[PDB]
Design a protein around this nucleic acid. Structure first.
Length: 68
DNA sequence: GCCAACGTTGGC
DNA sequence: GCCAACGTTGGC
């Protein structure tokens, strides 16, 4: 199952999804995606740190797993 | 032009 | 050799 799920560590409206690669050299590797409350797609802790503003300190946030 | 999906790269 | 970041590409 790789549907969108709430991500409360990030806060109301945020969605997360983990997808397993199906073919190629990297079959079985996974990738984690986020979707912002406003619909913006994020695929890296760098895109996400830039998005949320200085307000948020993600030092202790595991982007891959979605936890603190 | 966008994006799902896999490839490539650099720091570790 | 893993993995985070992001590059590339074909199908839409």
């Amino acid at each position: 199952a790789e549907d969108w799920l709430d991500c409360p560590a990030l806060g109301p409206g945020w969605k997360r999804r983990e997808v397993f690669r199906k073919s190629g050299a990297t079959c079985g590797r996974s990738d984690t995606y986020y979707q912002s409350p406003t619909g913006d797609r994020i695929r890296s802790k760098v895109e996400l740190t830039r998005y949320l503003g200085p307000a948020c300190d993600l030092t202790l946030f595991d982007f891959k797993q979605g936890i603190l």
